Design a binder for this molecule. Structure first.
Ligand SMILES: [K+]
Ligand SMILES: [K+]
Ligand code: NA
Ligand code: NA
Ligand SMILES: [Zn+2]
Ligand SMILES: [Zn+2]
Lengths: 123, 198, 123, 198
């Protein structure tokens, strides 16, 4: 009911595919930053939304700035998210497997400017 | 900025019979802190625990406080405020409480208080007086000295002494004692060596 | 093969002696901070080294400072460590039990300057 | 242009106890770099690996830096900036990091930083200080010297000194050491030659 994810200094997650076992009542993602760059130049978050909502999340988050962790405050399209983190930091997020559908496309991604085009995956 | 004044280093045991003590540490090279009785000199390592014992004949009243201040031992340097060197002033060693310029810190005491004196410019660090633990004869304070006797441009290798003063809740003097301090890399060897010239 | 540990606002861990079962392949520390002080004044971490290495890890860690979680970067003497947390935060760490010896003295400690004497215990 | 000042060559250990060290490499014909303890002089081949060991009593904090800089040894030549001769400056041996005029380079470290001092005109090369490896007791930097001592138009048979300075992230001085250098085609033989009058 958990997965470990890495964002590096080259705008890559270490997986493009997360599969949640639906015998899990809650799922947890543990994000780390194995690079050396601080979060003001290479910050990474883990953001969950539907596939249609992903682009909107990215766009508004990008206009929100580093202070808001590049997330639109109180964005209802974000199902779950970590904090934005830099080099050597870590943060985890737990959410209810209540809020997902077997017949629905879900995307995870990072909303730091530019990062989502490469830093994204399915769920 | 030099100070207009010079803090007293006159021993004053006062009403409660205030004395200083120090662990009987010896001079093995592994010691981090060792006191020479003959030289009345503390040899200690940078940022290492430096225990100093408070001994009283009788308990000081509630609200009593314990203050530490460094001054230079030599007369021509006495008016100059003892402070950290530029390198340590700017380094990333903050414990969240102590001011970055303060030579002396107290560890493991959330009531530690640090003062830049408005008028004398002296740095000092005061903690509340606590009686010895049950079965103990003294109160131990755990100081840290955050510059070296060989730092460039701080103490710039000049000798210093620490003054421990006991104060009531209003800051009035109840006792005073003092000891010389050498902050150095190998306190055991330095004490044995300096002790060898006697 | 897991253990839950807290550091309060009084510079105290809620245990001073950890045992890891020989059977375990991996061991997890679950560190939390039920106090109210932020981590620049009451930042705790759970750092594991040999007893012989503890003091060196602590001195070099202190001088590394808050922004390095009070740890010397890349310290070989550190078998495992959480990150620094403050009030309301939690962090876990998992290390292989193959990094331990049955004939060896291990310590766990916080490296926050001046808190190590008070926050330590045997593993 | 001459420099208007002369950098200090005064030894200085500083807060962390800065010393240098050199491999006990002997003087066999194969050796590319050999250090004379009696002369405090290094003999090395042009552009070959010269290990220089950094030794500290305690680890400098992160962001600490290590600078090397050449000056001529003869006082009357001390304001002349040590640089490469025209032939070598213009030759095809740039690693893409060092300026072609700089005598001193660092090999095997992409974090190398080079400086043309805008005020003194001195060249220097600097690397981040890295604490020793696992199972090692010192830090080793690998210098290359890009002219021979006899290079016409450059050092032209005037002995130089290399000055190693340890500095923090803001440039405050932590330690200084120095050694004479001869760059030559047979370092072991030439070390025997110069020790001959001892
Ligand atoms: K890292
Ligand atoms: K040596
Ligand atoms: Na003096
Ligand atoms: Na280079
Ligand atoms: Zn200093
Ligand atoms: Zn040349």
């Amino acid at each position: 009911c958990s997965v470990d994810i890495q964002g590096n200094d080259q705008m890559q997650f270490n997986t493009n595919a997360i599969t949640v076992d639906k015998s899990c009542k809650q799922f947890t993602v543990n994000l780390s930053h194995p690079g050396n760059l601080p979060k003001n130049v290479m910050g990474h978050n883990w953001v969950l939304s539907t596939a249609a909502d992903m682009q909107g999340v990215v766009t508004d988050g990008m206009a929100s700035g580093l202070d808001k962790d590049y997330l639109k405050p109180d964005d209802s399209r974000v199902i779950a998210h970590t904090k934005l983190i830099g080099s050597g930091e870590k943060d985890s997020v737990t959410f209810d497997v209540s809020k997902l559908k077997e017949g629905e496309q879900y995307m995870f991604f990072c909303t730091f400017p530019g990062h989502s085009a490469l830093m994204k995956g399915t769920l | 900025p030099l100070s207009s004044s010079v803090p007293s280093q006159k021993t004053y045991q006062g009403s409660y019979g205030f004395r200083l003590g120090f662990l009987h540490s010896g001079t093995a090279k592994s010691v981090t802190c060792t006191y020479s009785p003959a030289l009345n000199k503390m040899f200690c390592q940078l940022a290492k625990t430096c225990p100093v014992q408070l001994w009283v004949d009788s308990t000081p009243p509630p609200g009593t406080r314990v203050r530490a201040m460094a001054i230079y031992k030599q007369s021509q340097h006495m008016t100059e405020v003892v402070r950290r060197c530029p390198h340590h002033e700017r380094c990333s060693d903050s414990d969240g409480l102590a001011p970055p310029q303060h030579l002396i810190r107290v560890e493991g005491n959330l009531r530690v208080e640090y003062l830049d004196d408005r008028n004398t410019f002296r740095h000092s660090v005061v903690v509340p007086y606590e009686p010895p633990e049950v079965g103990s004869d003294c109160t131990t304070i755990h100081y840290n000295y955050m510059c070296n006797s060989s730092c460039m441009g701080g103490m710039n290798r000049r000798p210093i002494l620490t003054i421990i003063t006991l104060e009531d809740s209003s800051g009035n003097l109840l006792g005073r004692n003092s000891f010389e301090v050498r902050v150095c890399a190998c306190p055991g060897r330095d004490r044995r060596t300096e002790e060898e010239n006697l």
